Every structure is written in structure tokens, then in C-alpha cells.
Design a protein around this nucleic acid. Structure first.
Lengths: 535, 100
DNA sequence: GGAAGCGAAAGTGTCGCAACCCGAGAGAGGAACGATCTCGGGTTGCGACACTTTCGCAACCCTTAATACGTTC
């Protein structure tokens, strides 16, 4: 109508799409929708930035598990949730993952269903209203400032049903799906990496059935919690084989075979007609696959391979190279780890788990962002539980910086108990989860201290509420006791103070900070006493 | 594992080094050795054990030396059979303890 | 007829387990090798169950109705 036309010309995406659907200037409205999704610019740092960003703005939990009512505001770039009670942190990530399932389902299939809240586990036990709500609000540029979704569930036998409200998420996912069907666009990545990602590697890997090559395999098991590192290996070996081969040579060879078979049938051998028809079908299929591949605007296998290899080597510090070797008629992925060539199953658990996360994420981003110069600059939301899992302090100081550098437009929502990780993050990104004895909390607060660039010892004490020195160790109290003894004897080393001094020296050593502090105490107190005597 | 196997059963077999994974990848001599020395009081100051493995496809195989472990485990087993004694605990807790 | 959300019904694919096979290896019998048994790795078939796809309940009442009270369709 005229009203929709005005709103669409004003930049409203839904109005533009509605006009597109009714008329199916049909071309004009399509172009407007496609430009809304695809337009962006390269910033001063050389990074592509979408004009219309996509991120989760807000989450509300009502009578969900231990929460009566909890409201969380999320940052566009990075949100880190901290606290002792890790089972509530995990509940938050589960709530978000279920919401994201509704986008994934509808990008894959018209009328697709995402996941539902459980009547048994998701409803708070003492809820007066006997229902649960998980409410989310997403942002997609200034044309769609608010995309609300609610997942609901009521208890059995309640007088009224509480139904989920999913239509805005479906409408948005439909835009992506339909526009993509006509003309390839870049698509958002959604992924959850739980503590389950730490699992052993099956060294024996499956033959290429051909499902791993399909673009929407990128959404397979994406919110399951573990990734699919097995799928990565299969896909990566596949990429290698295609790179060493040529595409269309099989078509040319098949074309030659069909031409030779056609000559035989023309020469009077009618018995081979059945075989000709089979081979013609194979040729047509090969061309169609080639054409579909050509139609899908997908990057060359060589380029795909390069992007992923670079990503892995950039983000994973111990890995300088990754490649596929053909030894003993079986394809093995090899890596250069700490300067030495090893198989994936020879990697340490820490290295493997982290490699698996990055590899899986990079694979999905390459598959979903074929039109970007750098596919890792695509949009999406990634959830990571316990990011420091298996990582040494040195890696903890690099992990967030590396991830954010490799995936600049992903919204990361992470959980940690590492002060070292927090030293690399701004206090605005930090949300503290201190629930009551009943497990219930109303808001999550930022710390008062700025964490980014601060000393780890300060973050331990000021943010994590832990002593920088172990209180259960007697030696931790010796300097304090020493000081008290010195103050009791008017600053002079008595027999008792000397004994303790010698104990400090013996235990911590001659060059210890503790002994220097003791020496300092002696010097200062002696001088103070001298002043007192003069007076 | 060699102690445990032989406490449980006479001539029980413990575990062995992997010929696929446990040999150093750039070892010129293509075999690996794990040599352990145990102590059991002043009467038995040294109980040496060696686990060995040669790389896959090597012409000449390197044998593990496990007899001292078996001998000691035999003492525990046989004496216990006649009259109950206290036995040593051996346990490994790896990262997989966390898995459901 | 069939919105929006939901779940029944029915078909398909996944995946982990059990049973099996194989070669390696320490070294019983008694005094020269190498019997028997277990480790470790791989393959294959099976079936329970997760995942996928289609159907169908019925909101709304279209710009467009009338107003003395009852009954029936």
C-alpha cells in the first residue's frame, strides 16, 4: 500500500519485504532488501563493517529455573559473565542457545521449529504463576531496532496455556532465507561451545559422503555444545583433494566418455544404450553440481583452505602450520606444533580443544560468508563457556585478544573464572553473578574497578574476592607477626623478633621480597625509635 | 599397570607403549624407552622396570623388561593368599574424570 | 478458509555398543626357541532413538446487519 511504500522508502526492512512478497518495482524492493543485508564499509583498520549490525541486546528470565526475574543487558561486542555459582552461568547460556535455535531453524526451512522450554526442568519449582518465560530482544540496524522473541511454557493442568511468541524471529529469518534463494547473501553464524568441547579425538575419520560440502551443513549441530571437529577434518581433507584435482576435468573426461559411447551406439551396438543413458545422467549431474556451485557464488576450494589455515595459525599460538598428508593410502591432517610436525591426536588436550573451537568456527564462517573478502568478518553470535579451560596463564593473557582480532564482527558471550582473562577486558563488558542463598538474583552488576590493563593480583582481590596470599599457610602470616613483635619491643630486634627474622630469611631466602620488607621494617622502626628518644 | 596386573593374577600382563604415537617422530633410532626405579625399604632398594617399544615397520624389536615388577607383585599376591596383608593403592585421575 | 503456535504421525539418518578379527609381545614348557594368553587397534552389523517433514486444529468475520416480544431452520 502507499503506507508500506513510504516506510520502505524511509528504510524499513519489513515494509520493503512485504512489498516484495505482494508484487511477486518488485526488482526495486528486492534490491532494497538485499542492500540492507549486504551493504557495509571498510574502516580505517581495513576491517569490513556491516552498515546494519546484528546482536542480542537484552535477555529477561522469568520464573526460569532458580530465577524469579533476571534481566541482562549485553554488549554488542563482548560480554563476560563471572561468579562462583557456575550452574546459574550455564543456565544463562542455555536460555540464549534455545532462542538462537529459532533463527537457525527458519533460515534452513520455512516453518522450521527451534527448541522449546521443558515443563519439568525449566519452570521454577515454587513459581506462583506456574509458567516460565525467556524473553530476548535482538537488534538489526536502525531499520529494525527491536526484534523481540519470547519462549514460554506452562505447567500441566494450568487453566490457561502460555505460548511462545516467535513470529518476529521467523519473519527476520524468512528475509534471509528468501533473499538468499534468489541471490546469494552472507548469513549469520550462531554457535555454542560448552565444557563438552573437551572430548577425545577419533583418529579414524569418515569417507566423504558429500554432506559436508553443502553450505547449510554450517548450521548442523551448531548449538549442540561440542562443535563438530570431525566434520571439520572431513571437510578439510575434501578441500585438499579438490585442490590437487581439477574440477571440470571429470566433466571433460565424462564428456569424452559420453562422446565415445555415443559413437559406439551410432555404430550399431544397441546393447550399450542403457550404459550411455546412465553416463549421460552422470554428466548432467556433474554439470548441474558445477553450475549449482557456480550459481552459489562459493569461494574456490583453494581460497577456502587458505583462509581457514591462516585463522588457525593466527589464533592458536603453538600452531604455525596445518596441512593434509597422503601416507599409507589414507589422509592425515598434520600440524607444526611448537616447531615439530605432529598428528592432531598427538596434540596436548589444551591445544586440541582450542584448535577444535577455532577450526569449527572458521569452517562455518567460510561457508556462510562467501561474498566477503575476508569471510571471518561475517556477522554472528558465539557463546563460550569456561574460555580458560585447559589454558596456561600465558595463553589466558592472549586468548580474548586473538579471538576478537580473528572474528571482529562476532558478538561473544563468554564465562570465565580467570583474573588473567579479565585483565584484558573492559569493566563495562563484565557482569557479576552473585545470587542469594536461594540462587535468585535481579540484576548483574559491573565491577567498580577498571580491569583492562590492571594487575592480576588486584583483580583477584577486588573482583574475585580472593586473598593474593594463601591464608591457610602459616608462612603467609610471618611478616605480619614479625611487624607486631617489632612494635611491641619499641622497634628493637629482641630474641623473639630475631628468631622469626631468621625463619623468614631461612624460608623465603636472602633475595626474597619478604626479607626485603622485613629489612625495611627494621630500618624504619629503628629510625622512628631514635627520633622518639631524641624527643 | 604391571604391578596391578600381577597382584591380581600370576603372570598378568600390564599395558604397553603405542607404536603409532609414543615413539618420538624425529627419533633416528626408531624406538622408545620408559625406565622407572622403585624403592621398597632397605631390603629392596632398587626395583628397575623398563617399557620399550619399536616403531612400526622396524626390522628389530626392543623388548620391555618387566620381571622385577612381576617378582615384587608376586610377593604381595602370594603372601596375601596365605594371610591377609595391606596392599598398595595405584590410581590415575586424568582430565577425563570431568566427562559425564 | 485457515493466522500463529503447537504436536501427532510417520519416515530417515546417526551413532554407540557388542561381537568379532588381527598382529604384537612376554616368555611356559624345560634349557632352544617360542606355548598360551592378553594388549591395542580396526571392522561390521544392529537397533534405539534423534531428527525431519507433513498435516491439521480454527483466530479473524472482510466497506457492505438490525434492533416490539416469542418459536423454528
Amino acid at each position: 500500500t502507499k503506507q508500506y511504500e513510504r516506510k520502505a522508502k524511509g528504510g524499513n526492512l519489513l515494509s520493503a519485504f512485504e512489498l516484495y512478497q505482494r508484487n511477486s518495482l518488485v526488482g526495486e524492493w528486492f534490491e532494497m532488501c538485499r542492500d540492507y543485508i549486504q551493504d557495509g564499509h571498510v574502516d580505517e583498520s581495513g576491517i569490513f563493517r556491516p552498515d546494519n549490525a546484528f546482536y542480542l541486546r537484552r535477555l529477561t528470565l522469568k520464573d526460569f529455573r532458580r530465577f524469579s526475574l533476571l534481566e541482562i543487558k549485553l554488549e554488542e561486542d563482548l560480554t563476560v559473565i563471572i561468579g562462583n555459582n557456575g550452574k546459574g552461568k550455564t543456565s544463562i547460556l542455555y536460555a540464549i542457545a534455545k532462542t538462537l535455535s529459532w533463527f537457525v531453524a527458519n533460515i534452513l526451512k520455512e516453518g522450521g521449529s527451534g527448541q522449546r522450554l521443558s515443563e519439568m526442568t525449566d519452570i521454577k519449582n515454587d513459581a506462583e504463576d506456574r509458567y516460565s518465560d525467556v524473553s530476548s530482544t535482538f537488534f538489526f540496524g536502525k531499520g529494525l531496532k527491536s526484534v523481540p522473541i519470547r519462549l514460554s511454557r506452562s505447567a500441566l493442568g494450568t487453566a490457561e496455556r502460555r505460548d511462545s511468541e516467535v513470529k518476529p524471529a521467523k519473519d527476520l529469518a524468512d528475509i534471509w532465507r528468501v533473499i538468499n534463494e534468489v541471490n546469494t547473501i552472507n548469513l549469520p553464524t550462531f554457535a555454542l561451545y560448552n565444557v563438552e568441547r573437551s572430548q577425545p579425538f577419533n583418529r579414524n575419520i569418515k569417507d566423504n559422503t558429500g554432506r559436508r560440502e553443502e553450505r547449510f551443513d554450517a548450521y548442523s549441530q551448531t548449538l549442540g555444545g561440542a562443535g563438530r571437529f570431525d566434520h571439520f577434518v572431513e571437510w578439510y581433507i575434501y578441500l585438499h583433494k579438490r585442490t590437487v584435482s581439477d574440477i571440470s576435468s571429470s566433466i571433460k573426461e565424462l564428456e569424452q566418455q559420453v562422446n565415445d559411447l555415443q559413437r559406439t551406439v551410432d555404430g550399431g551396438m544397441v546393447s550399450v544404450k542403457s550404459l550411455l543413458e546412465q553416463m549421460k545422467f552422470k554428466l548432467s549431474e556433474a554439470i548441474e553440481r558445477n553450475d549449482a556451485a557456480v550459481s552459489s557464488r562459493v569461494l574456490t576450494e583453494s581460497v577456502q583452505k587458505s583462509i581457514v589455515e591462516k585463522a588457525i595459525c593466527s589464533v592458536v599460538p603453538s600452531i604455525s602450520n596445518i596441512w593434509v598428508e597422503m601416507i599409507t593410502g589414507s589422509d592425515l591432517v598434520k600440524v607444526t606444533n611448537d616447531g615439530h610436525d605432529v598428528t592432531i591426536d598427538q596434540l596436548s588436550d589444551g591445544q586440541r580443544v582450542f584448535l577444535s573451537l577455532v577450526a569449527d568456527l572458521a569452517r562455518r564462517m567460510v561457508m556462510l560468508n562467501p561474498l566477503l573478502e575476508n569471510p571471518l568478518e561475517g556477522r554472528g553470535i558465539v557463546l563460550i563457556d569456561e574460555i580458560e579451560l585447559h589454558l596456561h596463564p600465558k595463553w589466558q593473557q592472549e586468548v580474548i585478544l586473538n579471538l576478537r582480532s580473528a572474528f571482529p564482527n562476532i558478538q561473544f558471550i563468554i564465562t570465565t573464572h580467570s583474573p588473567i582473562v579479565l585483565s584484558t577486558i573492559e569493566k563495562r563488558c563484565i557482569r557479576e553473578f552473585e545470587p542469594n542463598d536461594d540462587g535468585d538474583q535481579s540484576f548483574l552488576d559491573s565491577p567498580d574497578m577498571q580491569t583492562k590493563g590492571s594487575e592480576n593480583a588486584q583483580i583477584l582481590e577486588q573482583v574475585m574476592n580472593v586473598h593474593s596470599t594463601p591464608p591457610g599457610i602459616a608462612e603467609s602470616h610471618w611478616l605480619g607477626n614479625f611487624e607486631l613483635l617489632l612494635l611491641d619491643n619499641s622497634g628493637e630486634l629482641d630474641n623473639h623478633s630475631q628468631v622469626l627474622y631468621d625463619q623468614i630469611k631461612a624460608h623465603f631466602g636472602i633475595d626474597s621480597i619478604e626479607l626485603k620488607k622485613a629489612d625495611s621494617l627494621i630500618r624504619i622502626n629503628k629510625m622512628k625509635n631514635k627520633l622518639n628518644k631524641i624527643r
